[PDB]
Protein backbone atom coordinates (compact mmCIF):
# COMPACT_ATOMS: atom_id res chain seq x y z
CA UNK A 1 0.00 0.00 0.00
CA UNK A 2 0.92 3.64 -0.59
CA UNK A 3 -1.16 6.40 0.96
CA UNK A 4 -0.22 9.14 -1.55
CA UNK A 5 -2.19 8.15 -4.66
CA UNK A 6 -4.78 6.13 -2.71
CA UNK A 7 -5.46 8.86 -0.15
CA UNK A 8 -5.62 11.71 -2.68
CA UNK A 9 -8.03 9.68 -4.81
CA UNK A 10 -10.40 8.21 -2.24
CA UNK A 11 -10.49 11.30 0.01
CA UNK A 12 -12.02 13.19 -2.91
CA UNK A 13 -14.33 10.26 -3.72
CA UNK A 14 -15.57 10.73 -0.14
CA UNK A 15 -15.46 14.52 -0.56
CA UNK A 16 -18.23 14.04 -3.11
CA UNK A 17 -20.08 13.10 0.10
CA UNK A 18 -19.80 16.77 1.07
CA UNK A 19 -21.15 18.15 -2.22
CA UNK A 20 -24.08 15.77 -2.68
CA UNK A 21 -26.96 14.69 -0.45
CA UNK A 22 -27.81 11.17 -1.66
CA UNK A 23 -25.75 8.13 -2.67
CA UNK A 24 -26.96 4.54 -2.34
CA UNK A 25 -24.99 1.75 -0.67
CA UNK A 26 -25.18 -1.80 -2.01
CA UNK A 27 -23.28 -5.11 -1.78
CA UNK A 28 -20.95 -6.67 -4.35
CA UNK A 29 -20.77 -10.47 -4.41
CA UNK A 30 -18.98 -11.18 -7.69
CA UNK A 31 -20.33 -12.62 -10.94
CA UNK A 32 -19.55 -12.49 -14.61
CA UNK A 33 -19.21 -9.01 -16.00
CA UNK A 34 -21.50 -10.25 -18.83
CA UNK A 35 -24.41 -10.33 -16.33
CA UNK A 36 -23.32 -7.11 -14.55
CA UNK A 37 -22.61 -5.28 -17.83
CA UNK A 38 -26.38 -5.01 -18.35
CA UNK A 39 -26.79 -3.83 -14.73
CA UNK A 40 -24.26 -0.98 -14.83
CA UNK A 41 -24.86 -0.24 -18.53
CA UNK A 42 -28.66 0.04 -18.43
CA UNK A 43 -29.96 0.85 -14.96
CA UNK A 44 -26.97 2.69 -13.64
CA UNK A 45 -27.93 5.84 -15.51
CA UNK A 46 -25.39 8.17 -13.90
CA UNK A 47 -24.11 5.82 -11.19
CA UNK A 48 -21.46 3.21 -10.51
CA UNK A 49 -20.78 -0.30 -9.29
CA UNK A 50 -17.52 0.47 -7.50
CA UNK A 51 -15.87 -1.86 -4.99
CA UNK A 52 -14.23 0.41 -2.42
CA UNK A 53 -12.97 -3.10 -1.85
CA UNK A 54 -12.73 -2.83 1.83
CA UNK A 55 -10.98 0.55 1.67
CA UNK A 56 -11.26 4.07 3.03
CA UNK A 57 -14.89 4.99 3.67
CA UNK A 58 -14.31 6.24 7.26
CA UNK A 59 -10.66 7.37 7.40
CA UNK A 60 -10.84 9.36 4.15
CA UNK A 61 -14.18 10.98 5.00
CA UNK A 62 -12.77 13.34 7.66
CA UNK A 63 -12.77 16.23 5.18
CA UNK A 64 -16.55 15.89 5.17
CA UNK A 65 -16.57 15.98 8.97
CA UNK A 66 -20.09 14.51 9.09
CA UNK A 67 -18.94 10.92 9.59
CA UNK A 68 -21.23 10.15 12.53
CA UNK A 69 -21.37 6.40 11.97
CA UNK A 70 -19.34 3.24 12.63
CA UNK A 71 -20.46 0.76 9.95
CA UNK A 72 -18.67 2.34 6.99
CA UNK A 73 -16.18 -0.56 7.07
CA UNK A 74 -18.60 -3.17 8.47
CA UNK A 75 -19.02 -5.73 5.71
CA UNK A 76 -18.81 -4.70 2.07
CA UNK A 77 -20.06 -1.23 1.27
CA UNK A 78 -20.66 0.37 -2.13
CA UNK A 79 -20.86 3.95 -3.34
CA UNK A 80 -23.50 4.06 -6.10
CA UNK A 81 -24.61 7.65 -6.76
CA UNK A 82 -28.11 9.14 -6.71
CA UNK A 83 -27.24 12.84 -6.34
CA UNK A 84 -28.52 14.01 -9.72
CA UNK A 85 -31.07 11.26 -10.33
CA UNK A 86 -32.44 10.48 -6.89
CA UNK A 87 -35.08 7.76 -7.18
CA UNK A 88 -33.90 6.57 -10.61
CA UNK A 89 -30.61 4.76 -9.98
CA UNK A 90 -31.70 3.91 -6.41
CA UNK A 91 -34.77 1.88 -7.30
CA UNK A 92 -33.09 0.90 -10.59
CA UNK A 93 -30.48 -1.00 -8.58
CA UNK A 94 -33.05 -2.10 -5.95
CA UNK A 95 -34.86 -3.95 -8.75
CA UNK A 96 -31.62 -5.91 -9.08
CA UNK A 97 -32.31 -7.21 -5.57
CA UNK A 98 -34.93 -9.31 -7.40
CA UNK A 99 -33.15 -9.50 -10.79
CA UNK A 100 -29.40 -9.78 -10.10
CA UNK A 101 -29.98 -11.44 -6.67
CA UNK A 102 -26.34 -10.91 -5.60
CA UNK A 103 -27.08 -7.98 -3.27
CA UNK A 104 -29.29 -7.04 -0.32
CA UNK A 105 -30.44 -3.70 1.10
CA UNK A 106 -28.04 -1.99 3.49
CA UNK A 107 -28.91 1.70 3.37
CA UNK A 108 -26.62 4.66 3.28
CA UNK A 109 -26.08 8.31 2.49
CA UNK A 110 -29.48 10.00 2.65
CA UNK A 111 -29.43 13.68 3.74
CA UNK A 112 -26.12 13.20 5.61
CA UNK A 113 -27.86 11.50 8.55
CA UNK A 114 -28.25 7.86 9.58
CA UNK A 115 -31.71 6.74 8.50
CA UNK A 116 -33.45 3.50 9.43
CA UNK A 117 -33.98 0.75 6.84
CA UNK A 118 -37.79 0.84 6.92
CA UNK A 119 -37.95 4.58 6.37
CA UNK A 120 -35.22 4.63 3.72
CA UNK A 121 -37.47 2.18 1.86
CA UNK A 122 -40.37 4.55 2.61
CA UNK A 123 -38.51 7.52 1.07
CA UNK A 124 -37.21 5.35 -1.79
CA UNK A 125 -40.92 5.05 -2.50
CA UNK A 126 -41.67 8.69 -1.58
Amino acid sequence: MAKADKATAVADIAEQFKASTATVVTEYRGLTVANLAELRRALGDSATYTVAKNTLVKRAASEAGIEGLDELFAGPTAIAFVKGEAVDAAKAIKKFAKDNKALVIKGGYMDGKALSVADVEKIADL
Partner: peptide, 13 residues
Protein backbone atom coordinates in the same frame (compact mmCIF):
# COMPACT_ATOMS: atom_id res chain seq x y z
CA UNK B 1 -22.64 -5.18 -29.21
CA UNK B 2 -21.00 -6.36 -25.96
CA UNK B 3 -19.38 -4.56 -23.01
CA UNK B 4 -18.28 -7.57 -20.97
CA UNK B 5 -15.12 -8.91 -19.31
CA UNK B 6 -14.03 -12.49 -18.56
CA UNK B 7 -13.29 -11.84 -14.87
CA UNK B 8 -15.45 -9.95 -12.39
CA UNK B 9 -13.09 -7.00 -12.74
CA UNK B 10 -14.44 -4.14 -14.82
CA UNK B 11 -16.50 -2.59 -17.63
CA UNK B 12 -16.10 -0.12 -20.58
CA UNK B 13 -15.01 -2.64 -23.20
Amino acid sequence: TKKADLNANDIDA
